[PDB]
Design an enzyme around this catalytic site. Structure first.
Site, PDB file in Angstrom:
ATOM      1  N   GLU A   1       1.081   6.188  10.800  1.00  0.00           N
ATOM      2  CA  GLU A   1       2.011   5.266  10.167  1.00  0.00           C
ATOM      3  C   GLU A   1       3.410   5.483  10.731  1.00  0.00           C
ATOM      4  O   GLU A   1       3.622   6.300  11.628  1.00  0.00           O
ATOM      5  CB  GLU A   1       1.990   5.428   8.647  1.00  0.00           C
ATOM      6  CG  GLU A   1       0.809   4.741   7.990  1.00  0.00           C
ATOM      7  CD  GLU A   1       0.837   3.238   8.174  1.00  0.00           C
ATOM      8  OE1 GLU A   1       1.910   2.637   7.974  1.00  0.00           O
ATOM      9  OE2 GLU A   1      -0.211   2.658   8.522  1.00  0.00           O
ATOM     10  N   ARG A   2       4.370   4.735  10.200  1.00  0.00           N
ATOM     11  CA  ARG A   2       5.711   4.738  10.761  1.00  0.00           C
ATOM     12  C   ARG A   2       6.416   6.058  10.485  1.00  0.00           C
ATOM     13  O   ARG A   2       6.242   6.665   9.426  1.00  0.00           O
ATOM     14  CB  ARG A   2       6.518   3.580  10.187  1.00  0.00           C
ATOM     15  CG  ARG A   2       5.744   2.284  10.127  1.00  0.00           C
ATOM     16  CD  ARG A   2       6.496   1.235   9.353  1.00  0.00           C
ATOM     17  NE  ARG A   2       5.829  -0.059   9.405  1.00  0.00           N
ATOM     18  CZ  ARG A   2       4.893  -0.448   8.550  1.00  0.00           C
ATOM     19  NH1 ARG A   2       4.510   0.359   7.575  1.00  0.00           N
ATOM     20  NH2 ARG A   2       4.339  -1.645   8.670  1.00  0.00           N
TER      21      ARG A   2
ATOM     22  N   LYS B   1       0.825  -1.203   0.000  1.00  0.00           N
ATOM     23  CA  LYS B   1       0.000   0.000   0.000  1.00  0.00           C
ATOM     24  C   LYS B   1       0.860   1.254   0.000  1.00  0.00           C
ATOM     25  O   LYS B   1       0.570   2.215  -0.722  1.00  0.00           O
ATOM     26  CB  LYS B   1      -0.936   0.006   1.206  1.00  0.00           C
ATOM     27  CG  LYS B   1      -1.960  -1.101   1.217  1.00  0.00           C
ATOM     28  CD  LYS B   1      -2.936  -0.900   2.352  1.00  0.00           C
ATOM     29  CE  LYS B   1      -2.220  -0.836   3.683  1.00  0.00           C
ATOM     30  NZ  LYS B   1      -1.655  -2.151   4.067  1.00  0.00           N
TER      31      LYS B   1
HETATM   32  N1  LIG Z   1       5.793  -2.713  -6.728  1.00  0.00           N
HETATM   33  C1  LIG Z   1       6.634  -3.575  -5.833  1.00  0.00           C
HETATM   34  N2  LIG Z   1       7.691  -4.226  -6.324  1.00  0.00           N
HETATM   35  C2  LIG Z   1       8.460  -5.005  -5.534  1.00  0.00           C
HETATM   36  N3  LIG Z   1       8.215  -5.164  -4.264  1.00  0.00           N
HETATM   37  C3  LIG Z   1       7.179  -4.550  -3.699  1.00  0.00           C
HETATM   38  C4  LIG Z   1       6.330  -3.703  -4.520  1.00  0.00           C
HETATM   39  N4  LIG Z   1       5.374  -3.221  -3.681  1.00  0.00           N
HETATM   40  C5  LIG Z   1       5.614  -3.727  -2.458  1.00  0.00           C
HETATM   41  N5  LIG Z   1       6.656  -4.476  -2.537  1.00  0.00           N
HETATM   42  C6  LIG Z   1       7.201  -5.181  -1.402  1.00  0.00           C
HETATM   43  O1  LIG Z   1       6.120  -5.451  -0.399  1.00  0.00           O
HETATM   44  C7  LIG Z   1       6.590  -4.726   0.855  1.00  0.00           C
HETATM   45  C8  LIG Z   1       5.464  -3.995   1.462  1.00  0.00           C
HETATM   46  O2  LIG Z   1       5.841  -2.648   1.714  1.00  0.00           O
HETATM   47  P1  LIG Z   1       4.626  -1.549   2.084  1.00  0.00           P
HETATM   48  O3  LIG Z   1       4.412  -0.584   0.886  1.00  0.00           O
HETATM   49  O4  LIG Z   1       5.033  -0.733   3.329  1.00  0.00           O
HETATM   50  O5  LIG Z   1       3.224  -2.383   2.384  1.00  0.00           O
HETATM   51  P2  LIG Z   1       2.144  -2.008   3.561  1.00  0.00           P
HETATM   52  O6  LIG Z   1       2.285  -0.565   3.950  1.00  0.00           O
HETATM   53  O7  LIG Z   1       0.762  -2.265   3.057  1.00  0.00           O
HETATM   54  O8  LIG Z   1       2.402  -2.894   4.786  1.00  0.00           O
HETATM   55  C9  LIG Z   1       7.640  -3.795   0.449  1.00  0.00           C
HETATM   56  O9  LIG Z   1       8.661  -3.711   1.491  1.00  0.00           O
HETATM   57  C10 LIG Z   1       8.231  -4.350  -0.759  1.00  0.00           C
HETATM   58  O10 LIG Z   1       9.359  -5.188  -0.373  1.00  0.00           O
HETATM   59 MG   LIG Z   2       1.660   1.430   4.695  1.00  0.00          MG
END
Ligand SMILES: Nc1ncnc2c1ncn2[C@@H]1O[C@H](COP(=O)(O)OP(=O)(O)O)[C@@H](O)[C@H]1O
Ligand SMILES: [Mg+2]
Ligand SMILES: Nc1ncnc2c1ncn2[C@@H]1O[C@H](COP(=O)(O)OP(=O)(O)OP(=O)(O)O)[C@@H](O)[C@H]1O
Ligand SMILES: Nc1ncnc2c1ncn2[C@@H]1O[C@H](COP(=O)(O)OP(=O)(O)O)[C@@H](O)[C@H]1O
Ligand SMILES: [Mg+2]
Ligand SMILES: [Mg+2]
Lengths: 187, 15, 39, 487, 35, 470, 466
Positions: free
Chosen positions: F181-182, F155
């Site tokens: 968020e963080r 997200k």
């Molecule tokens: N477009 C992408 N390509 C490669 N890896 C991705 C992509 N989107 C997310 N990820 C991986 O999934 C993980 C989730 O990160 P994050 O954006 O913070 O998800 P959320 O906030 O929903 O928990 C990321 O650290 C990344 O490693």
């Molecule tokens: Mg997030």
């Protein structure tokens, strides 16, 4: 209108009614006569006849209401005292009457600068040094405050003095001193 | 200072 | 050695305290004077 | 001694007495004292009972104060005198705590005398904002192959270790703590990591065994062990993580790097639930208080990586969460998963299949990822991760089996990053698709023995550069082919 | 609720993934030859 | 102004007694005698001349009897073009360490939603550059979007990609509100925007305002920081008529903080522990986030889905407040596809053959149909085996896998995770590529050639490279 | 100090003291009862009122009855005279053999041993049971727990452990019956009398019995565990002996705590349990431990409510044990007794550096093959046995042979199964399971490993059936 806060705050329904009557009488300069009247009605309601009548839960409300109104117009009370007893009778707080009078009494006490001060010793001590203690503890007060002492003796402190004035509190007993020095000697 | 002297006496007495 | 040095010392620290409670109205006078120094 | 018990343990004791503001215990039960008075006591202020006990003033109600007791409420009676301290809860912080075992308030429980701590620090301080922080770049080396390769952890990250009971979470934390020994006694100062281990709700003999493991490996000279065991009051188990976090924030704020393990946070949540139910606060899901997410987030937000204008310090947190029957969708597990920067999922199914540590590489995540790795380990681990994925979808296939048997590791055996990268090299470049898996670990034991006995210069160049250069790649090809011939 | 055998993730879902992707890996390395 | 006294402090909830001049609900009160500024927001009138407030900061060191002062109005933040490039907290204070935010107008964070006559029905498809969100669930210029997903599905990465693409191709003063968020991600966002010129610390020409209340703040701050960001965006939309962008991440934390204070506010819990006032509070917030006739607010919201539930009261309640929902699945991310958009759960309100034309609509519906039949064939592949399926079924499953791979795309913000170049695909390239994969024009290529590419041209180029190298 | 009862609700009795309010955990005596009714102070309520918990029945208590404060917590007689005797929660002899003439009395509420008194030695304790010794071996001085639902074999297994370890022991033993069948207590008493362990004629008794059973009010069932703890703690500290402490059932302690917490005016936690579940369990369990002044080998049977191992009480008691022996109903249905779940029982001395590389490898191989069989269970159940590869078929065959071999006849079961009780040394266990893992018995049928001792008996049974 808006209420006036007594010098102390009592809580519960007893405190609610006592603060109500304090704000009532303070708005009319009648705190002392209603104090006397409320102590009087405390004496009246600790009567065996009246206590067994009104504290009886299966006696109808209006009956004890009119009985209280009778004894209240007989006792020649202030309209504030009559209104308070009637309001207690309507809401059904006759069990809380002496609680309310006690809360009002302590409100008037703290209103008269009376701070509660307590001194403790291992054994009963001299009355001359008691007068010295009174005069010295008087220095911890503002002018307009009064000393109301209660000297209880506790032979478990091994000697010394445990003074509590209001909420300030000094511990000069030798029991706590040996405890402190022992925990310091251990660690 | 009954407790100043006692803690130094009673330990010296422990000697 | 450290075993004996420990227990003997904690026995020592226990001796003095149940001994001082075994062992005087100047304190009540000292408490009255020390109370005036609070101000 | 013979005179040193009175000379200053008595003559210096601060035997002064002063006018202090006090209160009076209305009721006391289940460690919750309702104190009448204390008109000027602050919220979350530490108060002190007439029987030497201590307590924190949590509830400030109009008619009383709800004081949680840091100890046993058996010694407290109604009408006792509660005296103020004037200070919010604080713990002693410093470098002297290194090598000590303390409780949730900073008192020594190992019988080695008082801590020579000069400064104190609150436990409920605020985490650093947005400006004082910088990106998480430095790698935190665990010594575990699966972690350091597929789930790398940076310095300033919050990596969750989550699994069921008896799956290997405490062992992961202990390996991570032991591994930092090589860096701590070395020469480079900004690679030293001072570990901190918080034992919350654990059995006391478990913490004794853990201190024995950490002192056998000489890993206690840089470790602080805060322990609020199962017999300690619920407020102590609730305060232990914040005390440990302040002890680590001391290092983090002074240009040093620390590491803190909360083992575990499920028991802190349980202690907080008890402490808040007894304060008549309304319960939420599973009777937990409403603000338990806040309880854990304000704690895990203090693990930061500061910039250079603040010293360049660091604090890595490794919270531990126990799940019930692999239910990762519970309340507290989902809270802490939402808070942290990644996870290390352990399973009992993988644990009993010989895969130890049972790190589920499919579910394990590191939101920082490659930014927290050395270049050589990155070069090999990219291809290793991709090959392990490809094997996991088709469970080539022999190369994947070889890689999984390569990931298996013993207990209390944290490798170096140089040795780790050499092993995963010898695994991914093809020199192991010839052996049968039942001798793979044998090969790695013998190969590591041979390399550390004979080829310290190659590993020294690996440790110095950080890249597996073509010279280093060629020499390592030489070594692995010659040893494979020997084997 | 179709596709539930793959949504569950038990034994019959893992073997579905294995069967399907081995078939398609064979077909992929065969189609890379015809090109 | 009135003057009160603290009478109770229980966690983040503070009771204040006003002997005269009871402050209306939602007013802000300034606790007197503190190091930093602590603002209490009145929540209830308890009677007895006492109000029950929520604290916007920590309540440590608060004393019963401490004097509180009524401000006379809700939390008023500084709004204007001077908030561009700056970071502010829930109560409108600078937290970037760059001095004070000197605006000429202050706007309360508690205002009314636009009425029915102030609504707008115009729908223009907002081209994104991402294949799946452009093909299946296209976004509208001025509509609320929403990005559903559990923990660790992408997200934040997707919202960073959207910020990058849109807010750089945009000219309308975007606004980012970080809600619970963080702080590490807040710092990363600040520095990523500084390096890419979107935030200009010198000679201010910045086009993004920042509002941050993070996981370490009490529930009051995490519940009102979304409204603070909303107020900044409302100003940019009303008093300038501009087209505004509003990125909220995460919006679930608003409802979660409401739930965290609900119990202490004196309210019986509802289902799943949420407050009894979940839906109406979320609606009071989300009905101000809308395109009126005065301006427009294209709103991208990241919505945390607790434990991949999607039936939890907070996600299930926020679904109805959106136009183009983009659900991110975990089972799809575990296939290595990124973004993890679920094609059979994402929805748009402009997916209408009279809005996106017949070709786009038909291609999207064919993609969804073939993916659903793929799901249905997976059971037969599970128990029978891939061998006995017809060549009809084998070819449809092959097309489905190839469409799956082609829905993935490398992001310019995901290089650190993948090492691949960031691809931005126009809409026509997407429509044409999916049309050609559906038609069978590339049934001779390996399925691994469509993985992590741009348009179909890069797919056939990757096919050629894989064919030569293997 | 003399108070007067002002409230009686079940086991919770409120007392109002006109002077000298007693501290918490004190023991109050009610005046005017046929027997001794002790109230244990639990809370102070203000108004000079305490809220106690009665150790016996409260029927006949009138509002206004007199209550005297004794001045100390419940004190039981401890010493070498309690050996061979039976005492209830408050320390009174319930065996009609007169008083217990000890010289010292110990309160049942003591502080847990500090951190610096813990010992770290983890020598193995051999039990003679195959699955226990192999996969989750016990330790001398460690804490052992036998989980299990209703009627799976907790009591049979603890009586087998008593038969094998208690009478073959050198030190002393303590059996604390906490909320279990009274007829089981009578059985144990008479069995120990006939076995010479309890001697009614001289002072050579080796077991002290403490019994508050399931017919007792919740206060007695909550404090009888503490009474047993106190007896064992005396035998550990003041004697330096190596004590054996058997507790059955330790779940009734938590259950009675919940029953009384209902009335103590506390907001309930999950599954309706007391908010103080883990803290009370910790203050009780941290006393059952080996220090450097003596060892306590603790075996505790732990009931599991509704066969739910995630219930707050067992889920909280897991973290207090050094070795868990989780019984299962799904395994008990197959006749495999003991029903020990091999893939759920653990031990902290299952460590190659402790038990040996051979033992560790055999245990881990057995567990791996059982986990493989468990993973195959689904396909086996739906698509039949045929669709497995022959490697999977061999894994399944060996795993079923191992499952049958983990079963064992108990010496205490000589009355309801007929088969002689087998006590298998550790070497026989390791050897037999290593041989079965190596494939040395892929020709014997699986019903030949069922309910045997060493592997030679399995071979002999295989020959006898043919
Ligand atoms: N477009 C992408 N390509 C490669 N890896 C991705 C992509 N989107 C997310 N990820 C991986 O999934 C993980 C989730 O990160 P994050 O954006 O913070 O998800 P959320 O906030 O929903 O928990 C990321 O650290 C990344 O490693
Ligand atoms: Mg997030
Ligand atoms: N990497 C490993 N290799 C071999 N054995 C291991 C490994 N890690 C753990 N074990 C063993 O598996 C068991 C798990 O112990 P551990 O304390 O590490 O797990 P845990 O998560 O802390 O469970 P709990 O806290 O409930 O006891 C231990 O007996 C340990 O010896
Ligand atoms: N090791 C065993 N051998 C034979 N039968 C057993 C064994 N364990 C249990 N059983 C049978 O299962 C029943 C349960 O016995 P018990 O130990 O009292 O269960 P629990 O105490 O858990 O309620 C016994 O009556 C017995 O017939
Ligand atoms: Mg552990
Ligand atoms: Mg039983």
């Amino acid at each position: 209108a808006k209420l006036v806060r007594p010098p102390v705050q009592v809580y519960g329904i007893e405190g609610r009614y006592a603060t109500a009557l304090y704000s009532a009488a303070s708005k009319q300069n009648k705190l002392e006569q209603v104090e006397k009247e409320l102590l009087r009605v405390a004496q009246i309601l600790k009567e065996p006849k009246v206590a067994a009548s009104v504290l009886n839960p299966y006696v109808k409300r209006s009956i004890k209401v009119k009985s209280l109104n009778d004894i209240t117009a007989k006792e020649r009370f202030s309209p504030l005292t009559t209104n308070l007893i009637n309001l207690l009778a309507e809401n059904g707080r006759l069990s809380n009457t002496q609680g309310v009078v006690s809360a009002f009494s302590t409100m008037m006490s703290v209103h008269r600068g009376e701070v509660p001060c307590t001194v403790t010793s291992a054994s009963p001590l001299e009355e001359a040094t008691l007068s010295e203690l009174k005069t010295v503890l008087k220095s911890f007060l503002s002018q307009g405050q009064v000393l109301k002492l209660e000297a209880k003796t506790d032979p478990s402190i091994l000697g010394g003095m445990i003074v509590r004035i209001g909420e300030k509190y000094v511990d000069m007993s030798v029991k706590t001193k040996i405890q402190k020095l022992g925990r310091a000697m251990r660690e | 200072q009954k407790l100043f002297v006692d803690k130094i006496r009673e330990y010296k007495s422990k000697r | 050695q450290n075993m004996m040095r420990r227990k003997e010392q904690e026995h020592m620290i226990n001796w003095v305290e149940k001994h001082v409670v075994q062992s005087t109205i100047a304190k009540c006078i000292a408490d009255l004077k020390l109370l005036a120094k609070k101000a | 001694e013979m005179s040193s018990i009175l000379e200053e343990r008595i003559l210096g004791a601060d035997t002064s007495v002063d006018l202090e503001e006090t209160g009076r215990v209305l009721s006391i039960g289940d460690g919750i004292a309702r104190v009448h008075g204390l008109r000027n006591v602050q919220a979350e202020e530490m108060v002190e009972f007439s029987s030497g006990l201590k307590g924190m003033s949590l509830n400030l109600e109009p008619d009383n104060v709800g004081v949680v007791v840091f100890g046993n409420d058996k010694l407290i009676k109604e009408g006792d005198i509660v005296k103020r301290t004037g200070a919010i809860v604080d713990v002693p912080v410093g470098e002297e705590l290194l090598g000590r075992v303390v409780d949730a308030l900073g008192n020594a429980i190992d019988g080695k005398g008082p801590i020579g701590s000069k400064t104190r620090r609150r436990v409920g301080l605020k985490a650093p904002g947005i400006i004082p922080r910088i990106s998480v770049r430095e790698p935190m080396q665990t010594g575990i192959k699966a972690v350091d390769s597929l789930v790398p952890i940076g310095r300033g990250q919050r990596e969750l270790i989550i699994g069921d009971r008896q799956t290997g979470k405490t062992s992961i934390a202990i390996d991570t703590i032991i591994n930092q020994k090589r860096f701590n006694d070395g020469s480079d100062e900004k690679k030293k990591l001072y570990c901190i281990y918080v034992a919350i709700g654990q059995k006391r003999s478990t913490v004794a065994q853990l201190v024995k493991r950490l002192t056998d490996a000489d890993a206690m000279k840089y470790t602080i062990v805060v322990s609020a065991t199962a017999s300690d009051a619920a407020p102590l188990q609730y305060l232990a993580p914040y005390s440990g976090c302040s002890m680590g924030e001391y290092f983090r704020d002074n240009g040093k790097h620390a590491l803190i393990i909360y083992d575990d946070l499920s028991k802190q949540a349980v202690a907080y639930r008890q402490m808040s139910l007894l304060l008549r606060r309304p319960p939420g899901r599973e009777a937990y208080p409403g603000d338990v997410f806040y309880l854990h987030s304000r704690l895990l937000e203090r693990a930061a990586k500061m910039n250079d204008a603040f010293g360049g310090g660091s604090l890595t947190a490794l919270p531990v969460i126990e799940t019930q029957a692999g239910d990762v969708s519970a309340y507290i597990p989902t809270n802490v998963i939402s808070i942290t920067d990644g996870q290390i999922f352990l399973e009992t199914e993988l644990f009993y299949k010989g895969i130890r540590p049972a790190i589920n590489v499919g579910l394990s995540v590191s939101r920082v990822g490659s930014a927290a790795q050395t270049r050589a380990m990155k070069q090999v681990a990219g291809t290793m991760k991709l090959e392990l994925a490809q094997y996991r979808e088709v469970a080539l296939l022999s190369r994947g089996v070889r890689l999984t048997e390569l990931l298996k590791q013993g207990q209390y055996s944290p490798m170096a990053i140089e040795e780790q990268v050499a092993v995963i090299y010898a695994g991914v470049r093809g020199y192991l698709d010839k052996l049968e898996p039942s001798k793979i670990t044998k090969f790695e034991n013998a190969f590591l023995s041979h390399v550390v006995s004979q080829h310290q210069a190659l590993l020294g160049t690996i440790r110095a550069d950080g890249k597996i250069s073509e010279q280093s790649d060629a020499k390592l090809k030489e070594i692995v082919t010659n040893f494979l011939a020997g084997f | 609720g179709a596709g539930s055998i793959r949504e569950a993730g038990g034994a019959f879902g893992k073997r579905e993934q294995a069967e399907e992707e081995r078939y398609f890996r064979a077909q992929s390395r065969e189609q890379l030859a015809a090109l | 102004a009135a003057t009160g006294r603290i009478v109770a402090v229980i966690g983040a909830v503070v009771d204040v007694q006003f002997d005269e001049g009871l402050p209306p609900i939602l007013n802000a009160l300034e606790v007197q005698g503190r190091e930093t500024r602590l603002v209490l927001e009145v929540a209830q009138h308890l009677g007895e001349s006492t109000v029950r407030t929520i604290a916007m900061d920590g309540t440590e060191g608060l004393v019963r009897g401490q004097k509180v002062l009524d401000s006379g109005a809700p939390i008023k933040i500084p709004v204007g073009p001077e908030t561009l490039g700056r970071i502010m907290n829930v109560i409108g204070e600078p937290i970037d360490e760059r001095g004070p935010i000197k605006t000429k107008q202050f706007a309360p964070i508690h205002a009314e939603a636009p009425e029915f006559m102030e609504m707008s029905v115009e729908q223009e498809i907002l081209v994104t550059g991402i294949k799946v969100v452009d093909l299946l669930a296209p976004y509208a210029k001025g509509g609320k979007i929403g990005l559903f997903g559990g923990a660790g599905v992408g997200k934040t990465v997707l919202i960073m990609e959207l910020i990058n693409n849109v807010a750089k191709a945009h000219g309308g003063y975007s606004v980012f509100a970080g809600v619970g968020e963080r702080t590490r991600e807040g710092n990363d966002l600040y520095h990523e925007m500084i390096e890419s010129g979107v935030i200009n610390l010198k000679d201010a020409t910045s086009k993004v305002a920042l509002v941050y209340g993070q996981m370490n703040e009490p529930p009051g701050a995490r519940a009102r920081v979304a409204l603070t960001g909303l107020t900044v965006a409302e100003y940019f939309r009303d008093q300038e008529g501009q087209d505004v962008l509003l990125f909220i991440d995460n919006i679930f934390r608003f409802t979660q903080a409401g739930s965290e204070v609900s119990a202490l506010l004196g309210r019986i819990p509802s289902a799943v522990g949420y407050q009894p006032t979940l839906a109406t509070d979320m609606g009071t917030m989300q009905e101000r986030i809308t395109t009126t006739k005065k301006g427009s607010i294209t709103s991208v919201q990241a919505i945390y889905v607790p434990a991949d539930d999607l039936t939890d009261p907070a996600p299930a309640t926020t679904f109805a407040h959106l136009d183009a929902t983009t659900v991110l699945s975990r089972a799809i991310a575990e296939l290595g596809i990124y973004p993890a958009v679920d094609p059979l759960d994402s929805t748009s309100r402009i997916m209408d053959p009279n809005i996106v034309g017949s070709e786009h609509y038909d291609v999207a519906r064919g993609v969804q149909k073939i993916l659903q039949d793929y799901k249905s064939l997976q059971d037969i592949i599970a128990i029978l085996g891939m061998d006995e399926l017809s060549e009809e079924d084998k070819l449809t499953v092959s097309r489905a896998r190839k469409i799956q791979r082609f829905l993935s795309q490398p992001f310019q913000v995901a290089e650190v995770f993948t090492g691949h170049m960031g691809k931005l695909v126009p809409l026509k390239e997407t429509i044409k590529g999916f049309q050609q994969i559906l038609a069978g024009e590339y049934d001779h290529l390996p399925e691994q050639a469509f993985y992590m590419v741009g348009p179909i041209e890069e797919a056939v180029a990757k096919a050629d490279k894989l064919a030569e190298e293997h």
